[PDB]
Amino acid sequence: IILGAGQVGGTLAENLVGENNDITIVDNNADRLRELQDKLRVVNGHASHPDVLHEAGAQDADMLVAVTNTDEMAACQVAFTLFNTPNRVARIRSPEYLAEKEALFKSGAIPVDHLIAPEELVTSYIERLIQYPGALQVVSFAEQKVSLVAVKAYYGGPLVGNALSALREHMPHIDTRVAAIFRQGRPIRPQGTTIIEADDEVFFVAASNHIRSVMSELQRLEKPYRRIMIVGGGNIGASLAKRLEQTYSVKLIERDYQRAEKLSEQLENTIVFCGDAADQELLTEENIDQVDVFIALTNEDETNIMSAMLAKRMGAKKVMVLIQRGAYVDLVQGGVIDVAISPQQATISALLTHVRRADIVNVSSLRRGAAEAIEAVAHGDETTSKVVGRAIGDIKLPPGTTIGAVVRGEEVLIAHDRTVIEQDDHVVMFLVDKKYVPDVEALFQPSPF
Amino acid sequence: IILGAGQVGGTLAENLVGENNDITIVDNNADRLRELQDKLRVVNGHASHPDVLHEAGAQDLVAVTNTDETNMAACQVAFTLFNTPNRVARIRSPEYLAEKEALFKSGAIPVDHLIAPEELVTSYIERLIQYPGALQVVSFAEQKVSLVAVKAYYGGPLVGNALSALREHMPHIDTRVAAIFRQGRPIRPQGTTIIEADDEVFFVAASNHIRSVMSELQRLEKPYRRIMIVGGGNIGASLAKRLEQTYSVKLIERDYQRAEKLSEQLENTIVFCGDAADQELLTEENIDQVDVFIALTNEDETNIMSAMLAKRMGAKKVMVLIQRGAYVDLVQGGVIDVAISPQQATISALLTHVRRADIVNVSSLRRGAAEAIEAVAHGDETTSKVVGRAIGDIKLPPGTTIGAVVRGEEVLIAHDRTVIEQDDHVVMFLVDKKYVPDVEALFQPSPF
Amino acid sequence: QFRSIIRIVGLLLALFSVTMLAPALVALLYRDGAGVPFVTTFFVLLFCGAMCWFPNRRHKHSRDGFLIVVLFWTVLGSAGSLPFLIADNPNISVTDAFFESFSALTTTGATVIVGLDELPKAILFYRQFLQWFGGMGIIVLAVAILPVLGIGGMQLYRAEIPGPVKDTKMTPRIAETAKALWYIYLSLTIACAVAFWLAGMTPFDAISHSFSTIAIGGFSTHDASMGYFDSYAINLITVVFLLISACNFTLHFAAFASGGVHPKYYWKDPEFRAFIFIQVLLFLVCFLLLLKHHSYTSPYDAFDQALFQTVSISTTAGFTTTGFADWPLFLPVLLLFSSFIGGCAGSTGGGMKVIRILLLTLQGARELKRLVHPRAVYTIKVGGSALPQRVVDAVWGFFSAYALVFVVCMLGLIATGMDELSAFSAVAATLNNLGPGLGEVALHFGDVNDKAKWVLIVSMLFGRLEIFTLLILLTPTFW
Amino acid sequence: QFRSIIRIVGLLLALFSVTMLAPALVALLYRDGAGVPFVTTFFVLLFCGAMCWFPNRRHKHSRDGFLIVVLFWTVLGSAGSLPFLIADNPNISVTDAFFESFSALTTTGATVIVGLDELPKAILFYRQFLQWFGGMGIIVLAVAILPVLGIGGMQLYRAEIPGPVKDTKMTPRIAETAKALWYIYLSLTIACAVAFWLAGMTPFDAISHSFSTIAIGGFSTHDASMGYFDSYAINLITVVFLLISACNFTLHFAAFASGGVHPKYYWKDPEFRAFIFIQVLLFLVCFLLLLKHHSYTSPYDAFDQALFQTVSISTTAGFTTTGFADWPLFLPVLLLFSSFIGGCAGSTGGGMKVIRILLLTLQGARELKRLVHPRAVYTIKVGGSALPQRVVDAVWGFFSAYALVFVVCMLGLIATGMDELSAFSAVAATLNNLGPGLGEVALHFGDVNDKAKWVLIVSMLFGRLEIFTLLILLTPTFW
Ligand SMILES: Nc1ncnc2c1ncn2[C@@H]1O[C@H](COP(=O)(O)OP(=O)(O)OP(O)(O)=S)[C@@H](O)[C@H]1O
Ligand SMILES: Nc1ncnc2c1ncn2[C@@H]1O[C@H](COP(=O)(O)OP(=O)(O)OP(O)(O)=S)[C@@H](O)[C@H]1O
Ligand SMILES: Nc1ncnc2c1ncn2[C@@H]1O[C@H](COP(=O)(O)OP(=O)(O)OP(O)(O)=S)[C@@H](O)[C@H]1O
Ligand SMILES: Nc1ncnc2c1ncn2[C@@H]1O[C@H](COP(=O)(O)OP(=O)(O)OP(O)(O)=S)[C@@H](O)[C@H]1O
């Protein structure tokens, strides 16, 4: 049960329902709820009082997810105290509830079975891009072992105009495969006939262990980032600084003095400032022509863009913004701004890894527009499954879908046309159109046992 | 263990410490805390974090923040990880009452005793309406005994008469003057004292028979019929939901969107939309026939400048709600008949839990230096200086005068010829409160 | 827009034809009857219903909803006349037939056939069957498709009214209200049907009068409704099966949700709490006026006759078990005014349902209080929470439109040669879906003029559709 | 409370007696008349008016205002009956007299005296004079004291009218509306009075018919209103002096504020902009129906007869210059329905003033638009600024109360032995303050039963007072 009809609850309510699982969402906002009722049972809820919560759920019994306005927990306790509902996931944003998580949560006091701390997820994610220079976006699936890494094709690049299969004739060291191609905002599924044009998002597949190795074999692993610049003093700005001052030369820009002082107190080895983001003097005076990346983490998405647009004009090697609402990302990305990050496309990314656990499909982090990458599980021996033993090239997959890899236990087999799908595999594939999932969900799913 | 340095925490921190009991208060407001640290040990604290709360509690509960939600967390943190005793925590927001039975009688939240301020004042205000002519009603730890205060005017049966001149007859149920407040300053009752005009004559009365006392003194006016209110907030709505069934209520609320919900929540009440000083609304709605004009707003200035008007038009009575409790005597009397304080009633309830089983219970009649107290006499004649000795033979500190004695469930009015027996709850009036550990040392039994 | 609509139309015409089979089956199980027009109609409609949707099987998806439901009755009402036109046994004209077709389907109950006692027992089933079909039609529409539209008139109907009490799920609409409500419908029709058998009358009259009381129609297989057998039981069953069928069916949904926990669901609905008082006070005053007048020899008959007439006329049922012979002239008029207070909303019922009247009485008194306390704030009590100013407007515009149609439809019947009194007696009987003319033993709908019977059809729709549904058809904004 | 009220009462009774002199003066200036009852009344009332306020000369100051104005007509109306009881020339019953007293003072115009042509010329002046007095009464109350109370009927009225147009020097809430309006009143009565003299008729009929046409009136010194002289001029003056006298007098306040700047004040008031259109469309359709029927030989007579009847019946005037002989039955009915839309508010006026109908048509169409655009925001256009939700409620609660009284007053006339049609023809004629019965066969109010003649009095007050003024009298909240 979802206690919200927000972009999180709505994106779930759309993504999770394939009749594979059944849920009931709660929201006091009727115009948005019956809008979210399209995507399913609605239990409009007066401030998470028990009559809603347990009757909507605990009598029927199903997993509880609470994402409403504030962090202050009360609803998960109302579900745990008098009903004993299991597998409760509750988003908690405010740091103080995180900073003492160990005291509170590993004592079992609060009943959160699994946390979804947005500031934590986004700040960890941004450090994951910095670590592999040249990576636009990194895609994470339910299986930690496999992950996609995306690059940008330019003039003079090793990958422009070349034939896809022309790279498939050599398999040097660790190997890759192009699972997706995004250009001009709209999706192109990879084919043998497709050519890599300029300004593309070439999404390579790579085993999570050896990602850096993949990018250096394609000559795209630039020199490690050294000098970083940030622009946000909020929950994400301080967390990122507290994570990068030990390994990277950080500079911060905060426009509220009383907060700029505590950032000077909380960050020992960082230089925090007091200025507006578009203060041309401050950016020049503080050596912006030698910046390698210009992370922008503000409240208003307009400000992140109009400052990160300024700071590639001056001379930063790269730029990153934080488009708060997550439905926009692919529209400002590419071109002048190299990377755009979304917290509500990362908070939802973690929720579809708990909900989908043990299910037929796991929805990847690569959801942009209609396209989404998914990970499908093949159960059952050759007697109770249409897709087991059959070679990849011999599967009548729905249109646009293309298998990119296969995860087996703890090793990643790149999908080749000559590969065999064995039982209990986690197949990683790229859907160009997401209206086809219950076709895949019906193909891989084992027949009655 | 407290968590406030406010008027609640400060008034407690002042009242409770006679070396009889020991406590530790918590507050992030340093300038107020170490000021309140005069009035014991101060733990500077951030929210209900265990470091401050939990460590202070064991090996070294009252929780009075700005908010209820923070208070609930503190009682749970103390109950979950140490299993601390008692735990009284104030909760103001109504819905935590509306589902109190579901929540609290399920034992989920660990409040051992609640102090719901909106409820206490509104019950109190109904307690004055029930006895017409009563300025203030005083409640002690023992429900059985209580003081009732009246106002002496020209033409009253009690003006200029000698106190003892009223003590010659003991008709039916009897009374006794435990306190006399005049001009704002306290006069302890004596045989030589005469009841002058515009006094606060505080009569003693068994809680059961209060109306009987006031009718024997010919002061029980006609029952109130028509009431008028002025607050649409937490106290205004609660009072309306209590009076529309028995009294003809009218309400005045100046915020429409709140005036509508009051029309939904109150079936038999007439709620309005107007400012308190709207002469047209008060005249148009027949204020010259109002019997009492309770004003229950946020700003004390507004209550006065409106309750003064309603008396002028005029109403039969007026009542205000002076939010801070420090001025109750100053505004009271004269033009405005009655002034009510939530922080002289919220603290009145907290001094009945804390003081439980102790030597003294501090009454609700605390104003300025004067306060009424209830002292407990333990031990037989061998381990107590004050037991068996007749009242007239106790060398009480100056200003202190015994008014009554509560023995089990029966109220004995103090007479000079009375004997104090063991395990008594004596009710008396202190003009000066600096004498408590003298009384607290007099009644207290010698080592056993 | 129009394309997928004609798909719906031809689809329903086919379903109507499938209904034609059940009558003719009776005209062969019985052979006191003529069945060929039903089987001639079954074919011709199936073709004419199929011919429209075959080239229109193209599927596509508020302006849609208003135009459907005027076709649901216009098309089905016209198609209903066909059996009467063909058969020579009635010897009924076209307008008399279109009238009897609409009067049946609209659950009105106003007839234009003289001496139907001895008419065949096959055409006699079709009349009552059409009331049953229009009985079900109003239920699915009023509870489900119509409220969405914005003229729900069901409890706090306005647009948003998603199942009212014990409204859980409710995501499937019409389709999760056509299936579930049928069980109440069938389980109520049979209960009365066998009850009439236990009263003693023939299976046919037992059944074909159950199709009529439950659908609040008022038809009969006898010229006199329930004077054919002046037995207290039949009356007392017809009384109790009109009161039970008149109330909100969303409250009759208090039996299919975890068994019989009725009384809490029923009595805590203010519409049912006002349906009783209005029903009691009516019969109560219609009884004291009979006892003071000695209209009937024994007060048991007076009780029988009164308690049936107030609950057959103020529930829009339209059954006559008397001739108002010994009744004051002043009683049929009062009963006719009580017709406007039709059955509870969400049920087969007449014009200004109890809420429309309940809301009207509530709001009308508030305007009387404010006159003395102008600066006071007042609200409406009906439900748990007061009504939105949209709904109060949606009743007071409904009264206005009602007395706007009722006057134009009156000065339209006057012109065709009727008299002032008979016009009022007619439109108040047809706009409210009542049936009997009422008054000092007056209207017989055969005497009505040809071009008035058309206006009457024009009117009985206006009452059956919530008046606005068809009034907006001629607006410029809709088109 | 009650004390200072009786001061006002006896004060007006004295003022009414001072009026009694002008009739008796004519019964001695003229040679056909009887003056003793007027002078017998002059004395007895002056005493009975003085006896009440002498021991009550104590002065003291909403609940006050409602109880005054029901006494203003109850007391003065009863007092008006006295002259008729005494004089034996029209020997007439008490209830026939109380009726003719109220009918005159209430400006109704419904008479119960047969053959008044040859009645004395002294009682003939008193009947018309009482209409004049009630003509002034409505003006001072409708525009001044009544709006403050809470029932306005005056453009935007709920309780907040400064007159809108030239809202200056309004300090004296009633002391400068009685003074200033009288000049308009007198300057209107004389203009028509001498105009009738220029038409040719005797001074008496010239003047005593101006008392009748300037106020809403309806009375006559001839059994037939204006068929006594079928001359186009008298009709064409009575037409224009009813249209001019029917509309808002605060729009006639466009002459006493800096001279004649009329057209801007008149036409920019939406009530007058709808008074014309409703008046034109009526006569226009009442004309084409006469021309298509060849009811009259020459279309000048048809024009004369129609244009007078629509503007004598829709303005609540009540003048009959015909017998509807060649008129379809369908015309007197339509005209009676048009009686509800009487003269513009704030003037001698009908049951539902133009605004009540104008507001009703405006709001009723908004409810038709919202049905298609549910999420749209709509407003009312009538004035400069859209109306407060208080006023829209005060129109729609007024319609409800109107059709609540009109039905209770109807089932009250039916019981006394009348017939459904005649009751409707009576209460619609008295609630609206229109004397004629208005049918092909008229109601002649002599035939009305004695007990009904009381209910008619009860009713004509309800229309003259804004219906609520007397409806709240029997509320529990008021007492
Ligand atoms: N006080 C509340 N109690 C319960 N539910 C609430 C409350 N306030 C908001 N909600 C619900 O939460 C949603 C609105 O929350 P938001 O303010 O949009 O939070 P949010 O930050 O937008 O969530 P995301 O991450 O952006 S999807 C609606 O579905 C409401 O039903
Ligand atoms: N140009 C700018 N415009 C707005 N805020 C800015 C700018 N530069 C720095 N900031 C800081 O951004 C802060 C926003 O912090 P919050 O309001 O707490 O939102 P937040 O979610 O906590 O921050 P995030 O999400 O961790 S980046 C402001 O208070 C400033 O301290
Ligand atoms: N986060 C917090 N942790 C602890 N105390 C807090 C916190 N925030 C506010 N306070 C308390 O806020 C109080 C001052 O405000 P309030 O007490 O709420 O005002 P008040 O309640 O009208 O005064 P009272 O009732 O006499 S305590 C102090 O006791 C502070 O300790
Ligand atoms: N000048 C005023 N005249 C009349 N009513 C007022 C005035 N000012 C405020 N009020 C009312 O008092 C309300 C204030 O209530 P809240 O602040 O929400 O709760 P509260 O009433 O302050 O709590 P208490 O118990 O009254 S101290 C306003 O919303 C109005 O309803």
Q: What is each CA distance from B349 to A161, B121, B242, C286, in whole angstroms?
A: 83, 11, 21, 62
**Which amino acid type is present at position A411?**
E
**Which amino acid type is present at position C238?**
T
> What is the DSSP secondary-structure string of C153-202?
-SSS-SS---SSTT-----S-SHHHHHHHHHHHHHHHHHHHHHHHHHT--
The CATH number given to B1-131 is 3.40.50.720
Q: Which residues 6+ apart lie within 8 Å of B230 measured at CB?
A: B236, B251, B252, B276, B293, B294, B295, B296, B297, B303, B306, B307
What residue ranges of chain B are covered by domains with CATH 3.40.50.720? 1-131, 225-358
Q: Which burial class, exposed, middle or buried, applies to C179 when counting CB atoms under 10 A from its CB (0-12, 13-18, 19+)? A: exposed
The answer as to CATH 3.30.70.1450 being correct for domain A360-449 is yes
The residue whose CA is least distant from atom 15 of ligand 1 is: A69
In angstroms, what is the C-alpha Rg of chain A?
23
Task: Identify which of B50, B80, B108 has the shortest CB distance to residue A81.
Answer: B108
Pocket test for ligand 1, best of A32, A68, A119, A299 (most atoms within 8 A of CB): A68
| B263 chain-C contacts, CB cut-off 8 A | 377-379, 386
Q: SS3 of D56, please? A: coil
Q: What is each CA distance from A206 to A145, A146, A209, A420, B106, in whole angstroms?
A: 9, 6, 8, 19, 54
Q: Which burial class, exposed, middle or buried, applies to A418 when counting CB atoms under 10 A from its CB (0-12, 13-18, 19+)? A: exposed
Cα angle for residues B349, B350, B354 (degrees, 5° grid): 130
Question: What's D353's DSSP letter?
Answer: E
Alpha-carbon gap, residue A41 to C122, rounded angstroms: 47
Architecture of domain A133-225: 2-Layer Sandwich (3.30)
Alpha-carbon gap, residue D386 to A297, rounded angstroms: 48
C378 touches chain B (CB under 8 A): yes
Alpha-carbon gap, residue D372 to C149, rounded angstroms: 9
B49 touches chain A (CB under 8 A): yes
Question: What's C252's DSSP letter?
Answer: G
What are the residues facing D7 on neighbouring strands? none
Specified resolution (Å): 3.8
| Residue B282 alpha carbon to ligand 4 centre in Å | 18
Cβ separation of A30 and C160 shorter than 8 Å? yes
Alpha-carbon gap, residue B286 to C376, rounded angstroms: 13
* Cβ atoms within 10 Å of D173's Cβ, excluding its own: 11
Alpha-carbon gap, residue A433 to C306, rounded angstroms: 70
The two tokens of residue A43 are 């239990």
Pocket test for ligand 3, best of B66, B72, B234, B341 (most atoms within 8 A of CB): B66
* Cβ atoms within 10 Å of D323's Cβ, excluding its own: 12
Per residue, what are the HEC states of chain B? CCCCCCHHHHHHHHHCCCCCCCCEEECCCHHHHHHHCCCCEEECCCCCCHHHHHHHHCCCCEECCCCHHHHHHHHHHHHHHCCCCCCEEECCCCHHHHCHHHHHCCCCCCCCEEECHHHHHHHHHHHHHHCCCCCCEEECCCCCEEEEEEEECCCCCCCCCEHHHHCCCCCCCCCCEEEEEECCEEECCCCCCECCCCEEEEEEEECCCCHHHHHHCCCCCCCCCEEECCCCCHHHHHHHHHHCCCCECECCECCHHHHHHHHHHCCCCECEECCCCCHHHHHHCCHHHCCEEECCCCCHHHHHHHHHHHHHHCCCCCEEECCCHHHHHHHCCCCCCEEECCCCCHHHHHHHHCCCCCCEEEEEEEECCEEEEEEEECCCCCCCCCCCCEHHHCCCCCCCEEEEEEECCEEEECCCCCECCCCEEEEEEECCHHHHHHHHHHCCCCCC
In angstroms, what is the C-alpha Rg of chain D?
22
Alpha-carbon gap, residue D127 to D130, rounded angstroms: 5
| A75 chain-B contacts, CB cut-off 8 A | none
The two tokens of residue B194 are 């005469």
Q: Which residues line ligand 1 (CB under 6 A)?
A: A 4-8, 27-29, 32, 47-48, 67-69, 344
Cβ separation of D394 and C337 shorter than 8 Å? no
> Is any ligand 3 atom within 6 A of the Cβ of residue B4?
yes
* Number of inter-chain CB pairs under 8 A, A vs C: 6
Q: Which residues 6+ apart lie within 8 Å of D410 measured at CB?
A: D423, D424, D427
Number of domains in chain C: 1
Q: Which of residues 166-225 of C touch A (CB under 8 A)?
A: 168-169, 171
The two tokens of residue C437 are 């003319």
**Residue among D84, D74, D83 nearest D105 (CA):** D74
Q: Which residues 6+ apart lie within 8 Å of D99 measured at CB?
A: D110, D112, D445, D453, D456, D457
Chains with 3+ CB–CB pairs under 8 A to A are B, C
Range of the domain at D385: 1-479
Q: Which residues 6+ apart lie within 8 Å of C347 measured at CB?
A: C139, C142, C216, C245, C246, C247, C248, C249
C426, C443 contact by CB (below 8 A): yes
Alpha-carbon gap, residue B435 to B360, rounded angstroms: 12
Question: Any idea which residue has 């996931």 for tokens?
Answer: A89
For an interface test with B, the pick among C375, C380, C382, C387 (most B C-beta atoms closer than 10 Å) comes out as C375
The β-bridge relationship of strands B292-293 and B227-228 is parallel
> What is the DSSP secondary-structure string of C328-391?
-THHHHHHHHTTSS-SPTTSS--SS-HHHHHHHHHHHHHHHHTTT-TTB-----SSSSPPPHHH
Q: Would you say how long chain B is, in residues?
A: 448
C325 touches chain B (CB under 8 A): no
**Which amino acid type is present at position D8?**
I
- Written out in words, the top-level CATH class of the domain with range B359-448 is alpha beta
Taking the CA of residue A256 as reference, the ligand 2 atom at the shortest distance is 31
B441 touches chain A (CB under 8 A): no
Q: What is each CA distance from C379 to A113, B259, D53, in whole angstroms?
A: 46, 10, 43
Q: SS3 of C214, please? A: helix
The two tokens of residue C232 are 């207290």
CA C382 distance to own-chain centroid: 24
Q: What does the CA dihedral D137, D140, D145, D147 come to, rounded to 10 degrees?
A: 100
**Residue among D227, D198, D225, D223 nearest D209 (CA):** D225
Q: Which helix (H) or strand (E) holds D352?
A: strand D352-353
The two tokens of residue A313 are 């004009």
User: Breaks in chain C at C–N > 2.5 Å: after which residues?
Assistant: 61
The CATH number given to A226-359 is 3.40.50.720
What residue ranges of chain A are covered by domains with CATH 3.30.70.1450? 133-225, 360-449
Task: Identify which of C159, C360, C478 has the shortest CB distance to residue D374.
Answer: C159
B217, B284 contact by CB (below 8 A): no
What are the residues facing B197 on neighbouring strands? none
Alpha-carbon gap, residue A277 to A272, rounded angstroms: 13
Q: What is each CA distance from D259 to B70, D30, D181, D262, D406, in whole angstroms?
A: 74, 39, 15, 8, 44
**Residue among D367, D318, D344 nearest D217 (CA):** D318
Confirm whether residue D433 is marked as ligand binding: yes
| B260 chain-C contacts, CB cut-off 8 A | 377, 379, 386
Pocket test for ligand 4, best of B250, B254, B279 (most atoms within 8 A of CB): B254
| Residue C377 alpha carbon to ligand 3 centre in Å | 36
The CATH number given to A1-132 is 3.40.50.720
Q: SS3 of C282, please? A: helix
On the question of a cis peptide bond just before residue A389, with omega within 30 degrees of 0, the verdict is: no
φ/ψ (deg, to 5) at A405: -160, 170
| C407 chain-D contacts, CB cut-off 8 A | 337
Q: SS3 of D341, please? A: strand
The β-bridge relationship of strands B338-340 and B319-321 is parallel
Question: Any idea which residue has 């087996």 for tokens?
Answer: A408
Interface of B with C (CB under 8 A): 253, 256, 259-260, 262-264, 267, 270-274, 281, 284-285
The CATH number given to B225-358 is 3.40.50.720
What are the residues facing C179 on neighbouring strands? none
Taking the CA of residue B8 as reference, the ligand 3 atom at the shortest distance is 26
**B198 φ/ψ sector (left φ>0, alpha ψ -120 to 50, else beta):** left
In angstroms, what is the C-alpha Rg of chain C?
22
- The CATH label, of 3.40.50.2000, 3.30.70.1450, 3.40.50.620, 3.90.600.10, for the domain at B132-224 is 3.30.70.1450
